[PDB]
Short mmCIF file of C-alpha atoms and ligand atoms in Angstrom, two decimals:
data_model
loop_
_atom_site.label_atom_id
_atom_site.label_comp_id
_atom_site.label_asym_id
_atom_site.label_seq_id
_atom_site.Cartn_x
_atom_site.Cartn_y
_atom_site.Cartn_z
CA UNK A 1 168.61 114.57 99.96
CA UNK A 2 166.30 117.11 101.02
CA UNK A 3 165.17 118.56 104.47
CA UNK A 4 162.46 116.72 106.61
CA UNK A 5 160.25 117.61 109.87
CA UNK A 6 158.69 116.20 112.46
CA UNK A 7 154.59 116.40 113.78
CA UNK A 8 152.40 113.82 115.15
CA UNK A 9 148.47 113.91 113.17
CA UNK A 10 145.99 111.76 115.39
CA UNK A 11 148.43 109.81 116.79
CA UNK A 12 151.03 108.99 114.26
CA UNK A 13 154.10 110.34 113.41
CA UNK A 14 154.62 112.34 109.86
CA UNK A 15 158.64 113.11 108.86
CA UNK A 16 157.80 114.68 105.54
CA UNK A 17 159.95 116.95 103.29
CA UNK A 18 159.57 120.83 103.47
CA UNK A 19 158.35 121.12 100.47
CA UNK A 20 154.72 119.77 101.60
CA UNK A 21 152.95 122.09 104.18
CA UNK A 22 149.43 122.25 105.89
CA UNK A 23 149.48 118.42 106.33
CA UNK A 24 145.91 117.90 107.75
CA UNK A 25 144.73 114.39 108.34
CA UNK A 26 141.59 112.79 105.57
CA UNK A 27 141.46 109.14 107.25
CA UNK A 28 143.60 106.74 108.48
CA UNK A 29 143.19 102.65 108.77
CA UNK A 30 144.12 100.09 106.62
CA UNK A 31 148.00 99.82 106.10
CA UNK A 32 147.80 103.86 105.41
CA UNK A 33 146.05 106.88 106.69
CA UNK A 34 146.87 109.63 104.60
CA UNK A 35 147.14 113.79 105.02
CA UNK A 36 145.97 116.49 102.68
CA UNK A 37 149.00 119.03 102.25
CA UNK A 38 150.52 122.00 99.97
CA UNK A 39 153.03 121.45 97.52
CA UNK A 40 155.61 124.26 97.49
CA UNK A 41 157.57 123.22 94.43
CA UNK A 42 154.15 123.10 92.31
CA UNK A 43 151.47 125.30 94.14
CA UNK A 44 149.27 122.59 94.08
CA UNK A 45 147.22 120.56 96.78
CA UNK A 46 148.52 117.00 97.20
CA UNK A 47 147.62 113.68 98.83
CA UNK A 48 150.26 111.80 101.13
CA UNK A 49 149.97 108.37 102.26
CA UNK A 50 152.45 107.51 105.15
CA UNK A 51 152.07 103.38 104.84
CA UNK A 52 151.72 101.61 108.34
CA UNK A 53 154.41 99.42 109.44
CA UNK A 54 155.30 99.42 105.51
CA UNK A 55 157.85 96.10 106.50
CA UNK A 56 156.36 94.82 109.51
CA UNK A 57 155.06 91.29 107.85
CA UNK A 58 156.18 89.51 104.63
CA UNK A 59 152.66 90.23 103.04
CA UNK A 60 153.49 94.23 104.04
CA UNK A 61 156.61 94.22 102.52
CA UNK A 62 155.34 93.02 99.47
CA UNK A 63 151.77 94.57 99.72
CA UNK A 64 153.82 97.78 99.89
CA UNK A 65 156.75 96.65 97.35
CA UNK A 66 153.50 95.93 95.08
CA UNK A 67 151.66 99.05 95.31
CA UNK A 68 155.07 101.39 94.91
CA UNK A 69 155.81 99.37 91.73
CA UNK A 70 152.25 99.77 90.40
CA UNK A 71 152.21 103.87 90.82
CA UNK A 72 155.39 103.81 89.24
CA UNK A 73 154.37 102.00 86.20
CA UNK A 74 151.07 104.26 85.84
CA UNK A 75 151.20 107.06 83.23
CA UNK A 76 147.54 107.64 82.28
CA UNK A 77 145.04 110.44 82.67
CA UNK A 78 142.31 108.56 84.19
CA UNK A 79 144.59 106.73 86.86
CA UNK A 80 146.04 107.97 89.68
CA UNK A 81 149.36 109.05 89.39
CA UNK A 82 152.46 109.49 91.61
CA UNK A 83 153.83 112.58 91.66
CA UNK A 84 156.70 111.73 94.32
CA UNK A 85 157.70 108.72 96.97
CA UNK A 86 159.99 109.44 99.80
CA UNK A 87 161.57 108.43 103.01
CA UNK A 88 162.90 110.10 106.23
CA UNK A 89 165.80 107.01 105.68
CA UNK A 90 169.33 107.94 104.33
CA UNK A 91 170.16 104.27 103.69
CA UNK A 92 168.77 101.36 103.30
CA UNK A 93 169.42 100.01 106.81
CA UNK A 94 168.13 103.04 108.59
CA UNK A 95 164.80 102.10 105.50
CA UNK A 96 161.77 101.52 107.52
CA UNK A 97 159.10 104.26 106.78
CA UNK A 98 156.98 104.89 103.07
CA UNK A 99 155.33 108.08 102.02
CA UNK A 100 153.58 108.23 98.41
CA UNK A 101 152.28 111.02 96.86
CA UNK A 102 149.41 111.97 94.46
CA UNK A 103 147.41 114.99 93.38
CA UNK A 104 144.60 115.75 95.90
CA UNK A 105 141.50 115.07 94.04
CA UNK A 106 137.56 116.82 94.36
CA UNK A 107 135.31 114.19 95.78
CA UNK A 108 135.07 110.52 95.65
CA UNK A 109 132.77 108.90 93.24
CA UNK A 110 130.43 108.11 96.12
CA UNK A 111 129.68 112.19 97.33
CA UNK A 112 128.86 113.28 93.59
CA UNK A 113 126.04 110.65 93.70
CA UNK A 114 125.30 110.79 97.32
CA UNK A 115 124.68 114.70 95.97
CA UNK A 116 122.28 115.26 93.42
CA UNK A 117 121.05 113.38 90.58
CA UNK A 118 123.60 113.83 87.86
CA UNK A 119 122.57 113.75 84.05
CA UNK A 120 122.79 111.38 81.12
CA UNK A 121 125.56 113.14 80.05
CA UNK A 122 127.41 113.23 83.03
CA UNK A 123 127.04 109.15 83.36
CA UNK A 124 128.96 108.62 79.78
CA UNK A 125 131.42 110.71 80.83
CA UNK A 126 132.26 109.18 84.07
CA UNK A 127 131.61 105.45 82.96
CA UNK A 128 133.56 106.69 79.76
CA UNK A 129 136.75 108.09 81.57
CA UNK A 130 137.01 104.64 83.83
CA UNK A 131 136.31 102.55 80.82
CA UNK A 132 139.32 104.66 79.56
CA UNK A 133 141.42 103.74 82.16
CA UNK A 134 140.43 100.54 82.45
CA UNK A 135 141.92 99.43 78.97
CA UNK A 136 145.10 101.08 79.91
CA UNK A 137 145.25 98.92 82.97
CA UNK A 138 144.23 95.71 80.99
CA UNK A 139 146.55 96.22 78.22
CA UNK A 140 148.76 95.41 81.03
CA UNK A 141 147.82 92.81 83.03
CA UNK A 142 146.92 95.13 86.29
CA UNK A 143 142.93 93.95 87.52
CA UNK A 144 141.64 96.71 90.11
CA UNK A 145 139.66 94.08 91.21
CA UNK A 146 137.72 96.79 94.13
CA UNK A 147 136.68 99.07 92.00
CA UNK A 148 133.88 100.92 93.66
CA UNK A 149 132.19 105.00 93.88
CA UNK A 150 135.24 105.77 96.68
CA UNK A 151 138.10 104.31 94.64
CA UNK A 152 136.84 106.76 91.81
CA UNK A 153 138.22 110.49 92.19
CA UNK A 154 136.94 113.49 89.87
CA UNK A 155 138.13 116.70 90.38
CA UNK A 156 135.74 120.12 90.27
CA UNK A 157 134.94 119.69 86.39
CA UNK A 158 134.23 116.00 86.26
CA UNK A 159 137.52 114.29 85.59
CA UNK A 160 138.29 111.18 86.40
CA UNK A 161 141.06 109.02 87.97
CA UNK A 162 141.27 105.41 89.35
CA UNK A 163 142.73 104.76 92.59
CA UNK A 164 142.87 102.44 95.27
CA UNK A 165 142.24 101.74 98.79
CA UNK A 166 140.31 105.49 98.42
CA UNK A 167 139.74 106.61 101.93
CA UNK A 168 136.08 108.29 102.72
CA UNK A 169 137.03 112.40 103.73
CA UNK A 170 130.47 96.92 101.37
CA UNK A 171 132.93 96.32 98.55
CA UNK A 172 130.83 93.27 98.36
CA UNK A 173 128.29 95.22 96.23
CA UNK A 174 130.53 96.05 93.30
CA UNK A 175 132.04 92.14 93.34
CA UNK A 176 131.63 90.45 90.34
CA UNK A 177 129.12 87.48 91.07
CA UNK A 178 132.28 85.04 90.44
CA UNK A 179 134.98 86.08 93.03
CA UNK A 180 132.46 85.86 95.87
CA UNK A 181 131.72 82.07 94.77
CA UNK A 182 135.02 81.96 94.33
CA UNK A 183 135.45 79.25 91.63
CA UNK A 184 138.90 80.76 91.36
CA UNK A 185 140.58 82.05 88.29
CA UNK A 186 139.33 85.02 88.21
CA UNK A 187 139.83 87.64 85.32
CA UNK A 188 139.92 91.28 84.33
CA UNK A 189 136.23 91.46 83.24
CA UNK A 190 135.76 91.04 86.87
CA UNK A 191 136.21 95.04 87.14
CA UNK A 192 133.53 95.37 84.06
CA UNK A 193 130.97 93.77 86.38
CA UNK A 194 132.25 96.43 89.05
CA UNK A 195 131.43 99.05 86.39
CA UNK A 196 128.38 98.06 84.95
CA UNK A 197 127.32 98.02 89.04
CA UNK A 198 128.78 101.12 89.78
CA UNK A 199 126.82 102.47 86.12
CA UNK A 200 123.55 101.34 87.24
CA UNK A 201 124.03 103.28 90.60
CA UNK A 202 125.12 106.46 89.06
CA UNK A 203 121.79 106.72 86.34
CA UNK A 204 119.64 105.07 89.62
CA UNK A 205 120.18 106.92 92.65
CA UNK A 206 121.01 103.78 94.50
CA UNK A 207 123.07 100.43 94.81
CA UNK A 208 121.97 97.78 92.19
CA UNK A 209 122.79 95.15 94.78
CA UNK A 210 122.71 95.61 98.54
CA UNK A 211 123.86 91.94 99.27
CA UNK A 212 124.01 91.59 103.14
CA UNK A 213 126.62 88.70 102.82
CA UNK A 214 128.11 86.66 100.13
CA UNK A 215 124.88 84.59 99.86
CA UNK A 216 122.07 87.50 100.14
CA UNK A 217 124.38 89.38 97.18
CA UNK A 218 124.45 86.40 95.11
CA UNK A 219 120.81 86.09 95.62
CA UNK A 220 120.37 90.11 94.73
CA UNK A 221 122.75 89.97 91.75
CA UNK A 222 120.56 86.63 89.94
CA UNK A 223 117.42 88.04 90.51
CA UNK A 224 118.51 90.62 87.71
CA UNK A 225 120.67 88.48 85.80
CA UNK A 226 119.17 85.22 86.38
CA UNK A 227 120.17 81.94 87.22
CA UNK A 228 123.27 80.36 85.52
CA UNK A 229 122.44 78.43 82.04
CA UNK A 230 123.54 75.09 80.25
CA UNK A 231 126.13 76.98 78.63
CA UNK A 232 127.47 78.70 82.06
CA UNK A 233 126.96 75.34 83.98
CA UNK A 234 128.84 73.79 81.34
CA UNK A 235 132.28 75.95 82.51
CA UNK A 236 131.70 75.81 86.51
CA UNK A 237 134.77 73.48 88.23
CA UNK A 238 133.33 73.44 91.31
CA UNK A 239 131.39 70.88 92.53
CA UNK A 240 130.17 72.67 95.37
CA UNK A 241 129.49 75.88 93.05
CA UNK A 242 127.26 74.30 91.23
CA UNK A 243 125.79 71.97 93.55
CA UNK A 244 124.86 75.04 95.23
CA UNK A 245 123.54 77.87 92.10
CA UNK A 246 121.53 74.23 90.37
CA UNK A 247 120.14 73.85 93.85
CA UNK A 248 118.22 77.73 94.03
CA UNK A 249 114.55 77.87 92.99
CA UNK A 250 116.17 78.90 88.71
CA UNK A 251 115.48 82.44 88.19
CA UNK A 252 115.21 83.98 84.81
CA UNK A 253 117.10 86.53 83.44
CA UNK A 254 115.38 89.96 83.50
CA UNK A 255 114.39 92.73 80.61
CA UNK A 256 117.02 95.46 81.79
CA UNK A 257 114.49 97.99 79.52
CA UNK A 258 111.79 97.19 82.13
CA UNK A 259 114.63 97.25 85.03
CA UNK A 260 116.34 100.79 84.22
CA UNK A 261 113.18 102.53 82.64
CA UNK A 262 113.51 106.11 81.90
CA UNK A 263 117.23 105.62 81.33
CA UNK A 264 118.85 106.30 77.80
CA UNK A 265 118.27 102.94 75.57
CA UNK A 266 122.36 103.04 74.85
CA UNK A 267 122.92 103.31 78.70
CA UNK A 268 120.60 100.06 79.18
CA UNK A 269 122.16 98.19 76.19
CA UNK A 270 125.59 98.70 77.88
CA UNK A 271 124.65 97.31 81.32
CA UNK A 272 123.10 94.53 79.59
CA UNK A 273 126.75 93.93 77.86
CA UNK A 274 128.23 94.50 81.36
CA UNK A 275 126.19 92.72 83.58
CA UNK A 276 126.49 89.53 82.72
CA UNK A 277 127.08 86.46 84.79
CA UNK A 278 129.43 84.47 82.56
CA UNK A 279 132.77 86.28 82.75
CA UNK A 280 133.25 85.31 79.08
CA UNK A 281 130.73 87.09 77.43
CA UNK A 282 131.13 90.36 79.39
CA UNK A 283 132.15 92.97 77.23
CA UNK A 284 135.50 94.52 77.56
CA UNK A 285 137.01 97.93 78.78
CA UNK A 286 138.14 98.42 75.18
CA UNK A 287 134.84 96.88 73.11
CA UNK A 288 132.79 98.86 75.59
CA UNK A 289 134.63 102.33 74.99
CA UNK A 290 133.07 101.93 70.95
CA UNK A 291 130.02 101.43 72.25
CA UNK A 292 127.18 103.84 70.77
CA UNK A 293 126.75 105.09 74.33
CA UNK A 294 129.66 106.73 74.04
CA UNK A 295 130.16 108.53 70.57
CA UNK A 296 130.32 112.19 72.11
CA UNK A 297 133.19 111.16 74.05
CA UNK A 298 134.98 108.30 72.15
CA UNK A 299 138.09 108.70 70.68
CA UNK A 300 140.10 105.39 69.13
CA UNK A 301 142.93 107.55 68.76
CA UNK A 302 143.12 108.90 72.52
CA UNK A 303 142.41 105.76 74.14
CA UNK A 304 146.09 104.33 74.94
CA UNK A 305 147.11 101.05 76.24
CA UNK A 306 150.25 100.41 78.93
CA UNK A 307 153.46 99.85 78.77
CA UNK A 308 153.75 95.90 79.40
CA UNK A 309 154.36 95.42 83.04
CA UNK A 310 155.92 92.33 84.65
CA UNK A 311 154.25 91.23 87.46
CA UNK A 312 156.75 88.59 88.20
CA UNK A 313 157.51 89.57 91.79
CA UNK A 314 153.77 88.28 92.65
CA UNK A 315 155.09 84.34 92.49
CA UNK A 316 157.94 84.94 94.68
CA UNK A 317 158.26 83.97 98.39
CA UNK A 318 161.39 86.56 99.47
CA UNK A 319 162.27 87.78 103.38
CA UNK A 320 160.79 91.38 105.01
CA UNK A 321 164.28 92.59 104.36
CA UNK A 322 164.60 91.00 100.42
CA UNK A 323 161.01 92.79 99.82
CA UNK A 324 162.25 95.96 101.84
CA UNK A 325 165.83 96.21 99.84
CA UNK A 326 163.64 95.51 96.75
CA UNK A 327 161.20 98.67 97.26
CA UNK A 328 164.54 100.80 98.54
CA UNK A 329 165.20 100.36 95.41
CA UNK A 330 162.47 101.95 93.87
CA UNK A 331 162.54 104.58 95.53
CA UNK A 332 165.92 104.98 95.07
CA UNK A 333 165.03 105.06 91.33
CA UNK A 334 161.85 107.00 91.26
CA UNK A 335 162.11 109.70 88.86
CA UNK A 336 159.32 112.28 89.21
CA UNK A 337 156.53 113.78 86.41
C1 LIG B 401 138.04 113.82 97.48
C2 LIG B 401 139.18 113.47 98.44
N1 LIG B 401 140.27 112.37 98.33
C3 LIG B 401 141.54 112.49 97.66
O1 LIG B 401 141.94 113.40 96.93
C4 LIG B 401 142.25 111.38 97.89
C5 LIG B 401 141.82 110.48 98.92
N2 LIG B 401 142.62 109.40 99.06
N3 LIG B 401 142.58 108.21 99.95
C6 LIG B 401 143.43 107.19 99.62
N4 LIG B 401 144.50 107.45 98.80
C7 LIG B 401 144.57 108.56 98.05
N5 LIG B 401 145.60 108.67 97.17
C8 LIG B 401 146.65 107.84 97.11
C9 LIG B 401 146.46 106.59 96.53
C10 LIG B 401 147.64 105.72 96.43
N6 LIG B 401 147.54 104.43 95.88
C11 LIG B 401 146.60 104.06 94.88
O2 LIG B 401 145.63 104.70 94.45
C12 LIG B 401 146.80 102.72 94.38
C13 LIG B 401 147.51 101.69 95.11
C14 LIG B 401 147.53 100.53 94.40
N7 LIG B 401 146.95 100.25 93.16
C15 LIG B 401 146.29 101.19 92.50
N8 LIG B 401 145.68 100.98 91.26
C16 LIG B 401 144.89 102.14 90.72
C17 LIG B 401 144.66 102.02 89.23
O3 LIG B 401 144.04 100.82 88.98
C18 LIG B 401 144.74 99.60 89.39
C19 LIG B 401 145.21 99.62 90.84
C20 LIG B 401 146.22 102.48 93.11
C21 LIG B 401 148.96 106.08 96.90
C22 LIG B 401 149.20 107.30 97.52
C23 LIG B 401 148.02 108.26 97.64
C24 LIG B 401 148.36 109.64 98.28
C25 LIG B 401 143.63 109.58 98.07
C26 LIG B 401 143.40 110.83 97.27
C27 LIG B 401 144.21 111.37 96.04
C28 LIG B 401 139.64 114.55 99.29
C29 LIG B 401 139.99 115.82 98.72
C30 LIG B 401 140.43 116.90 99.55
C31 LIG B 401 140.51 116.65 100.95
C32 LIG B 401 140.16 115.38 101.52
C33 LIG B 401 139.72 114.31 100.69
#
């Protein structure tokens, strides 16, 4: 073991190891609220989550035994990674509190742009470095799935990591148009859309689509890209879905050129690739890092895939204390970076 110690930040108790010092609170809500702190054994500034009620409900057991087993299985340089998981808990019956780790980052996605105007330059190598980690996540399986400016961290000279449930020092505007309409079966290319949205933002100073609610940000998205063709209609299951999209006044796809003037030519040709409303066409993390737009950065050599990772866990109905034991035993197991 190590030694621990007590303090209370806003109103919630933090039994962290010596090693971390300075914890000051960054935001809390959701099933986390994390602390900015020092790390003694490395000098360097860290980020700790302490997860809420970590084993309170089935879906937090598993929502946490899911997220502890997806940092652990992340080794890439443009995804977050965990540099240490811990517990105030000498066994596994005394288990009932969660702390991850990760390297404290500069400024979410959503400051830079909030900022200034950032150049050409600066959007391939953002959009590159997600792209980047993007295939790595893919080549595995893993879909972000709310991938947005504040679930993207760069650091003071523009690097850039993936990470989720970011919390600020609508989601709804970075969904692809499918998983909002639902018709289920939803894929990975669902995060290109996110992209490609998240793209458009960072060479425009604002948020391609604004939707209010699920029907004003369908309405947003097909102005740009149109209303759904033959071929699209052709591969809609839902009765209701397309009851509803054949039933709008048909728009017509748009001339991005005329949409994103000013921007580089190879930036527009991308978001046309990207934004796309049939899932199947969209172009992928990997396809898209080749992509003229990014020559100064691309690198088919440095542009690794994962490890496979078995997801298996996600089909399984198990008790608070199965999906508890089960994420004891990963920490258990966790060996540092
Ligand atoms: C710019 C400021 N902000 C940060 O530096 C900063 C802010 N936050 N807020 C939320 N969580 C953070 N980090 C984190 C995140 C996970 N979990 C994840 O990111 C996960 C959980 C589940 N799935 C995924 N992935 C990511 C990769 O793609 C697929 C899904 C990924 C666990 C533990 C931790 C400490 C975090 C950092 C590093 C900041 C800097 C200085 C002072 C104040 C703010």
């Amino acid at each position: 073991r190590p030694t621990f110690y007590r303090q209370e930040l806003n109103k919630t108790i933090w039994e962290v190891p010596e090693r971390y010092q300075n914890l000051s609170p960054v935001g809390s809500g959701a099933y986390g609220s994390v602390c900015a702190a020092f790390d003694t054994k490395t000098g360097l500034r860290v980020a700790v989550k302490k997860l809420s009620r970590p084993f309170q409900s089935i879906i937090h057991a598993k929502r946490t035994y899911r997220e502890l087993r997806l940092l652990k299985h992340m080794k890439h340089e443009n995804v977050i990674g965990l540099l240490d998981v811990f517990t105030p808990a000498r066994s596994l019956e005394e288990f009932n509190d969660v702390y991850l780790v990760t390297h404290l980052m500069g400024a979410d996605l959503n400051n830079i742009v909030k900022c200034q105007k950032l150049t050409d330059d600066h959007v391939q190598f953002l959009i590159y470095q997600i792209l980047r980690g993007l295939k790595y996540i893919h080549s595995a399986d893993i879909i972000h799935r709310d991938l947005k400016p504040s679930n993207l961290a760069v650091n003071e000279d523009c690097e850039l990591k993936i990470l989720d449930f970011g919390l600020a020092r609508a989601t709804r505007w970075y969904r692809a148009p499918e998983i909002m309409l639902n018709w289920m079966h939803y894929n990975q290319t669902v995060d290109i859309w996110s992209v490609g949205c998240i793209m458009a933002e960072l060479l425009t100073g604002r948020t391609l689509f604004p939707g209010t609610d699920h029907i004003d940000q369908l309405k947003l998205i097909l102005r740009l890209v149109g209303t759904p063709g033959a071929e699209l209609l052709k591969k809609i299951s839902s009765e209701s879905a397309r009851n509803y999209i054949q039933s709008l006044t048909q728009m017509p796809k748009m001339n991005f050129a005329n949409v994103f003037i000013g921007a580089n030519p190879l930036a527009v040709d991308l978001l046309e690739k990207m934004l796309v409303l049939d899932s199947d066409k969209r172009i992928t993390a990997a396809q898209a890092l080749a992509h003229a737009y990014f020559a100064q950065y691309h690198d088919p050599d440095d542009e690794p895939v994962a490890d496979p990772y078995d997801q298996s866990f996600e089909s399984r109905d198990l008790l608070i204390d199965e999906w508890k034991s089960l994420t004891y035993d990963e920490v258990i197991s966790f060996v540092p970076p």
